[PDB]
Amino acid sequence: VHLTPEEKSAVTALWGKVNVDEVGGEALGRLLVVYPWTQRFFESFGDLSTPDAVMGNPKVKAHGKKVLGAFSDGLAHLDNLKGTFATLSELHCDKLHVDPENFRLLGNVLVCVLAHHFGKEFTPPVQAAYQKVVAGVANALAHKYH
Amino acid sequence: VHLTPEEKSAVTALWGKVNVDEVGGEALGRLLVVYPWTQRFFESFGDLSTPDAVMGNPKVKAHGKKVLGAFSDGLAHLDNLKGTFATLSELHCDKLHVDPENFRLLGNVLVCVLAHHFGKEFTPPVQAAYQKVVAGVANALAHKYH
Amino acid sequence: VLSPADKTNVKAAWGKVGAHAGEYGAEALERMFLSFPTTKTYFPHFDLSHGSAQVKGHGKKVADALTNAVAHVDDMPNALSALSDLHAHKLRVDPVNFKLLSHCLLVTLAAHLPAEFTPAVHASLDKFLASVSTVLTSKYR
Amino acid sequence: VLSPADKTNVKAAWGKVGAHAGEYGAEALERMFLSFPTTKTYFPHFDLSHGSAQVKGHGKKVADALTNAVAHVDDMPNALSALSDLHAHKLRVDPVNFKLLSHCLLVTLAAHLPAEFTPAVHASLDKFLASVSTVLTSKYR
Ligand code: HEM
Ligand code: HEM
Ligand code: HEM
Ligand code: HEM
Ligand SMILES: */[SH]=c1/[nH]nc([C@H]2COc3ccccc3O2)[nH]1
Ligand SMILES: */[SH]=c1/[nH]nc([C@H]2COc3ccccc3O2)[nH]1
Ligand SMILES: */[SH]=c1\[nH]nc([C@H]2COc3ccccc3O2)[nH]1
Ligand SMILES: */[SH]=c1\[nH]nc([C@H]2COc3ccccc3O2)[nH]1
Ligand SMILES: S=c1[nH]nc([C@H]2COc3ccccc3O2)[nH]1
Ligand SMILES: S=c1[nH]nc([C@H]2COc3ccccc3O2)[nH]1
Ligand SMILES: S=c1[nH]nc([C@H]2COc3ccccc3O2)[nH]1
Ligand SMILES: S=c1[nH]nc([C@H]2COc3ccccc3O2)[nH]1
Numbered sequence: 001v002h003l004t005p006e007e008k009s010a011v012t013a014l015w016g017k018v019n020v021d022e023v024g025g026e027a028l029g030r031l032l033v034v035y036p037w038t039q040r041f042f043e044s045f046g047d048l049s050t051p052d053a054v055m056g057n058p059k060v061k062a063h064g065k066k067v068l069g070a071f072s073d074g075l076a077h078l079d080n081l082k083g084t085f086a087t088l089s090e091l092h093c094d095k096l097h098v099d100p101e102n103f104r105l106l107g108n109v110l111v112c113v114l115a116h117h118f119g120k121e122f123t124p125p126v127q128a129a130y131q132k133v134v135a136g137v138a139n140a141l142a143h144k145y146h
Numbered sequence: 147v148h149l150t151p152e153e154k155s156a157v158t159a160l161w162g163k164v165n166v167d168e169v170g171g172e173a174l175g176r177l178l179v180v181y182p183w184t185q186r187f188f189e190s191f192g193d194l195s196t197p198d199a200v201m202g203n204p205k206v207k208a209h210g211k212k213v214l215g216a217f218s219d220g221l222a223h224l225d226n227l228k229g230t231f232a233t234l235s236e237l238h239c240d241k242l243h244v245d246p247e248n249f250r251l252l253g254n255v256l257v258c259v260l261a262h263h264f265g266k267e268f269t270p271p272v273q274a275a276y277q278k279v280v281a282g283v284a285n286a287l288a289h290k291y292h
Numbered sequence: 293v294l295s296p297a298d299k300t301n302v303k304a305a306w307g308k309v310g311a312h313a314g315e316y317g318a319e320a321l322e323r324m325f326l327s328f329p330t331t332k333t334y335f336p337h338f339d340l341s342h343g344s345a346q347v348k349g350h351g352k353k354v355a356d357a358l359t360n361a362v363a364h365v366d367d368m369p370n371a372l373s374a375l376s377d378l379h380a381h382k383l384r385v386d387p388v389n390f391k392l393l394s395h396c397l398l399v400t401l402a403a404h405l406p407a408e409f410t411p412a413v414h415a416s417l418d419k420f421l422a423s424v425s426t427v428l429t430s431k432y433r
Numbered sequence: 434v435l436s437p438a439d440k441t442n443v444k445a446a447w448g449k450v451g452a453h454a455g456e457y458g459a460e461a462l463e464r465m466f467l468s469f470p471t472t473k474t475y476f477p478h479f480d481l482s483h484g485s486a487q488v489k490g491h492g493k494k495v496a497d498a499l500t501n502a503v504a505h506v507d508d509m510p511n512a513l514s515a516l517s518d519l520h521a522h523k524l525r526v527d528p529v530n531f532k533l534l535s536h537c538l539l540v541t542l543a544a545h546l547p548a549e550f551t552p553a554v555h556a557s558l559d560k561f562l563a564s565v566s567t568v569l570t571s572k573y574r
Contacts, residue, residue, distance in 0.1 A: 426567060
């Protein structure tokens, strides 16, 4: 992706203050809560019929920690999310059959999670930068279509 | 993309019988007719308020001939739609700001156009192959996200 | 909602398809299963095989539900409430899948009726299926 | 449609936002204009500038239309018919854009009310905006 020096900066400045232990399970939990059909990919996770059951689910938090792990890689190779997520792109696209639309969903729930935590600090320009990265990452995950 | 030898074959066998002078303006005209919001990218084209006015519009047919031109390139470099459409990908993604969703729309209207012309010859397996290519091409157009 | 012309086009298409309704419904499904294999994971205990009888049988159920939609164009939310519950609440069908079946309904239609599948009709049928699809995913809202 | 709990959550959020409705509406738009510049091509003769007064003014119109939606949760198709005509017929707004404004409404909400923006509320507000968005693009169906 292409971010101005100001965006590239605000994004890493923001990320550095991200609780990587929680933020990922929260974005994943909100995705599953808010868009119930996504719960179908995680049946092994258990009863996801209530929001509190989804959010406190240890497997949801564990797995969520990996997802955040990926976005972190992205912010580390913004101009290479092509290869960085290349492997994942195959996982999600080739083996799983996740509709790219759902990648867009998750990415935007992440943005809302970030806004939920940084409040007013998540200014329009700052949100604008993340939509950029999030858009990049989702594109990379969809990238590999073999 | 990855097609079985049977799909890769059915696709070119099919394409070879495609009236490249008409099929493109028809897919484009149906897109504009059926999904009216897409008419906003082609204001210079004139009054598109009726289906017959859209389909007979000379600029719609001309331009449509180019779109088909592109898909033809794709069927010629299925394992390289990455670079083949690379240039276009920038045109549509970087300069235009077309939402990738609309690429999906156009591609599927093309499939319907093909079904409209080949009737029963456009068998499920045959349609299945084109959804593949069409999915590839749309992915390539969305590929470049700079 | 559907214009008077749109209603007339959909019925014209419904009348012309007539007896082939269940069959077209099975074909659209076979088409959807093959072009978007992901959709198959919703019919696990099904013989998604070709000449499958379970598919032949679901095609008919789908066409009947559509015929019911045609008879309640101005009612649909009501007329489909049950179906909307099945698909949205109990089945958790990804809304994108409705665009995929609908797209497959149109191909089927178009392939069997090349000459009647004009841009206007295409337009009318598209609006109809999207109304149906929107009612069925309405329990997510 | 919205459950009783969903209705209660949306109103709770509506009551809590209270006076800031027009402002949040202007912010969600500023946010949408910046994150999805493509959306700006719908407001040509507008000063999409920051402190813009035209934006401040459209934010209020949007929040008012939403408040009207809240008061007709079980009526919306009706209550918004005019708006549905504006946006679908005369303006030809790409339906994807509704997901983008809604997503921006939620960020705005979430950013000003971190603690109340729980997963359940998020869920309720999401269903609401999608109901609104679906009514507004309903003239394409
Ligand atoms: C931008 C969005 C996404 C990112 C960055 C992402 C990231 C990840 C990562 C890091 C893994 C773990 C890989 C490993 O452990 O080696 C993974 C696995 C997976 N992802 Fe995602 N993912 C994304 C979106 C989605 C969406 C929308 C779905 C919903 C269908 C999904 C379904 C899965 C599944 C089924 C797995 C494996 C689950 C399991 O271990 O049981 N992902 N994802
Ligand atoms: C898989 C889908 C698509 C393909 C293969 C495609 C192909 C093409 C090609 C070959 C060109 C002409 C480039 C040149 O002359 O150098 C072009 C231009 C363009 N495309 Fe597409 N396109 C796609 C989808 C779309 C969609 C959905 C939109 C709708 C917003 C769109 C809007 C445009 C515009 C605005 C232009 C230039 C129009 C003009 O010359 O006035 N395209 N496209
Ligand atoms: C055009 C929109 C659709 C229509 C009119 C339709 C119609 C129907 C009908 C008539 C039934 C029978 C309900 C009953 O007997 O109570 C049914 C069941 C079902 N539908 Fe749909 N459907 C539509 C879209 C979808 C889509 C997109 C999927 C998923 C890819 C889907 C998955 C299912 C499943 C899994 C069942 C249950 C099958 C079983 O286990 O017996 N449907 N549908
Ligand atoms: C949450 C859904 C939305 C709501 C509640 C909403 C509300 C409104 C309202 C209240 C008006 C005034 C109508 C009148 O005075 O007759 C308006 C106008 C308009 N809306 Fe929306 N809107 C929504 C989404 C959108 C989106 C997604 C776009 C496009 C990106 C958009 C573009 C417009 C435009 C271009 C106008 C006319 C502006 C002018 O030229 O004065 N709206 N909307
Ligand atoms: S706060 C929240 N939760 N989900 C969402 C939206 C974000 O916007 C959006 C755009 C395109 C596709 C999916 C999607 O989900 N916002
Ligand atoms: S025959 C016809 N015309 N338009 C369409 C559909 C095809 O299905 C589809 C899937 C995903 C996104 C857009 C879309 O438009 N079918
Ligand atoms: S996993 C993945 N990524 N892209 C794709 C295919 C299918 O769907 C699609 C939707 C919109 C634009 C391009 C594509 O190509 N699968
Ligand atoms: S032109 C283009 N192609 N991809 C993109 C961005 C924005 O939207 C999007 C939607 C679904 C998956 C990935 C992306 O990335 N712009
Ligand atoms: S974006 C957007 N809004 N409406 C649509 C289309 C896409 O999928 C369809 C597929 C078949 C018939 C109608 C359809 O509605 N795409
Ligand atoms: S809720 C929600 N989000 N997106 C939708 C889709 C469902 O399927 C459709 C199928 C065709 C046209 C519009 C559609 O709206 N429903
Ligand atoms: S696919 C599908 N179906 N429904 C949605 C989402 C995506 O966009 C939204 C953005 C904000 C609130 C609700 C939303 O509905 N995506
Ligand atoms: S018609 C048609 N096709 N796709 C839609 C979208 C419009 O905007 C939405 C916004 C949020 C949730 C669902 C939505 O349905 N409407």
